[PDB]
Design a protein around this nucleic acid. Structure first.
Ligand SMILES: [K+]
Ligand SMILES: [K+]
Ligand SMILES: [K+]
Ligand SMILES: [K+]
Ligand SMILES: [K+]
Ligand SMILES: [K+]
Ligand SMILES: [Mg+2]
Ligand SMILES: [Mg+2]
Ligand SMILES: [Mg+2]
Ligand SMILES: [Mg+2]
Ligand SMILES: [Mg+2]
Ligand SMILES: [Mg+2]
Ligand SMILES: [Mg+2]
Ligand SMILES: [Mg+2]
Ligand SMILES: [Mg+2]
Lengths: 116, 131, 59, 60
RNA sequence: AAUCCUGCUCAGUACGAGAGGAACCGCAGGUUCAGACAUUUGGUGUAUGUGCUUGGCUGAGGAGCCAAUGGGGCGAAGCU
RNA sequence: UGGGUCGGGGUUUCGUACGUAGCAGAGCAGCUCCCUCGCUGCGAUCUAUUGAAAGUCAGCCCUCGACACAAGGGUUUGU
RNA sequence: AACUGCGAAUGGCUCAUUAAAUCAGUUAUGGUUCCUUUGGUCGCUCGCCACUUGGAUAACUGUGGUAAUUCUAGA
């Protein structure tokens, strides 16, 4: 029930098994047995050794579209306000565009007297 | 308190180990081990955390032809640590100390065995890492 | 509802600014009084009169 | 271990403090941007699948 | 047929002007020796177990063999 | 019922078998009504089949599968 | 405040290196690059948004981590 370690081969080293290797540069390694240890010491890469966990996941041995947008209240207008504004669609919107044109048309007639 | 448990020695008299401190010494030639009563024909041997008497073979001339107290901090012989782990290091290394236990140098290159640390607090403080 | 999490919804601090990001939010077709439909944020400080603040709409 | 929970639909993010490993271990061994169901905590976090968006180390 | 030593505590205590400086009980360990043992780590390894490899040989492939254990890596069990 | 002998399973050792396939492969050699970018060979090695193949009690573990064999032999022993 | 653009390659210090090297005078780039400034050029092309298109991100609100930094994450 001690800390569970992992080897050069990626295997799981139970307590009382293998050896631990402390290099001069400060890195510490643990090997499950002398086979994994000798492979590590001879500088063999575990990605090229077939029975190694690193090799197996490297070669993968054995192993949609979404989006949503939600309406929110925006400071100065509750969700009710925006819905009512965007529900002016059934010609209420068209009613508002056309009164602005005539509300600027008579101003244009005043502007004609102001321009000229 | 708590005393040091027995460990595999692996460094007999006549072993030349590296000097891991900045004293200017490069190696340490173990001439004896402290606390060794011994036995006929048996070489006094030391492990990590053991105080030894050593003479530096190569290094700086003012350190050479003298006997220095030294403490082994790294060993290449595998040793068991009461919890099942067999630990060994890349080299045999030691540091030069006085009889009181204070390291003559100021910094240690490389790790220091845990047994050597809690046995020698002066060496432990100067240790960059502990294994 | 999770207590204190799925309730008291916080509003977006401030509405759209680009003249097209307001049209998408409010289904503006074309020249339907685009300026007025922009959200007008009201400001209410105690040491001052109440007043609402509108932003400059780009493009 | 603290958990930062945010619900984009309603904002109102809030911090959850847990000291139980089992409620947390449903999240353990998962990468970021993976959606996980938080049915581990009590009876109130039910029908809730949540996405891991980030975190911080013991050292920050 | 067991042996001796160290560290902690007692204790900067007794004692002493001071400098210095113990002991009994207790605890944790070591030395030498003794009797075993192989779970672990190490050694051995002709399981002639399984890969690699040189020269030659069976027409080639495959499968093998010879070179007084061809050489070498890893290695069960057993011994240690 | 027994213990054997095979087989099977387990364990474990080594490290991914032969064959087949690949538009993998340094390149090289032939065929161009052909092809409009190809096909036919040689080629160490690579990939997949394939943690495969092989061994594993002879002093490893469990079998209840198969086969035969097991109330047989000889020499002695008395208050 | 922040995004953006520009500057930060100037100035200042020192003289360690460096002996056809540096540097000085002379000459070339018909053997090259060049922010900026100034002046040219900007309908020279036949070919359901143009009355103006798309998405994010800052600053900002809110939840934190870290012993620590002009560190930063999620929303
Ligand atoms: K002695
Ligand atoms: K062999
Ligand atoms: K071995
Ligand atoms: K062995
Ligand atoms: K094959
Ligand atoms: K394979
Ligand atoms: Mg002798
Ligand atoms: Mg503009
Ligand atoms: Mg005697
Ligand atoms: Mg050969
Ligand atoms: Mg062959
Ligand atoms: Mg012959
Ligand atoms: Mg011969
Ligand atoms: Mg070997
Ligand atoms: Mg079998």
């Amino acid at each position: 029930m001690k800390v569970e370690l992992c080897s050069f081969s990626g295997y799981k080293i139970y307590p009382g098994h293998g050896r631990r290797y402390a290099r001069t540069d400060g890195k510490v390694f643990q090997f499950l047995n002398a086979k994994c240890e000798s492979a590590f010491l001879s500088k063999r890469n575990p990605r090229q050794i077939n029975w190694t966990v690193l090799y197996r996941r490297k070669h993968k041995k054995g192993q949609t579209r979404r989006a949503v947008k939600f309406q929110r209240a925006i400071t100065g207008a509750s969700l009710a306000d925006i819905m009512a504004k965007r529900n002016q669609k059934p010609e209420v919107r068209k009613a508002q565009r056309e009164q602005a044109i005539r509300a600027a048309k008579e101003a244009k007639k005043a502007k004609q007297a102001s321009k000229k | 308190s708590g005393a040091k448990f027995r460990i595999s020695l692996g460094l007999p008299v006549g072993a030349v180990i590296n000097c891991a401190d900045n004293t200017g010494a490069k190696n340490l030639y173990i001439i004896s081990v402290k606390g060794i009563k011994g036995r006929l024909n048996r070489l006094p041997a030391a492990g990590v955390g053991d105080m030894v008497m050593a003479t530096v073979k190569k290094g700086k001339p003012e350190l050479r032809k003298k006997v220095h107290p030294a403490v082994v901090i790294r060993q290449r012989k595998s040793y068991r640590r009461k919890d099942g782990v067999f630990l060994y290091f890349e080299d045999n290394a030691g540091v030069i100390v006085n009889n009181k236990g204070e390291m003559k140098g100021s910094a240690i290159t490389g790790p220091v065995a845990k047994e050597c640390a809690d046995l020698w607090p002066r060496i432990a403080s100067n240790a960059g890492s502990i294994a | 509802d999770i207590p204190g999490l799925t309730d008291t919804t916080v509003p977006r601090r401030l509405g759209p600014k680009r003249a097209s990001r307001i049209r998408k939010l409010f289904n503006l077709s074309k020249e339907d009084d685009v300026r007025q439909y922009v959200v007008r944020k009201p400001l209410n400080k105690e040491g001052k009169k109440p007043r609402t603040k509108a932003p400059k709409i780009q493009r | 271990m603290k958990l930062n929970i945010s619900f984009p639909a309603t904002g109102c993010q809030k911090l959850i403090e847990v000291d139980d490993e089992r409620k947390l271990r449903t999240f353990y061994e998962k990468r970021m941007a993976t959606e996980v169901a938080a049915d581990a905590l009590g009876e109130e976090w039910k029908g809730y699948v949540v996405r891991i968006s980030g975190g911080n180390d013991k050292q920050g």
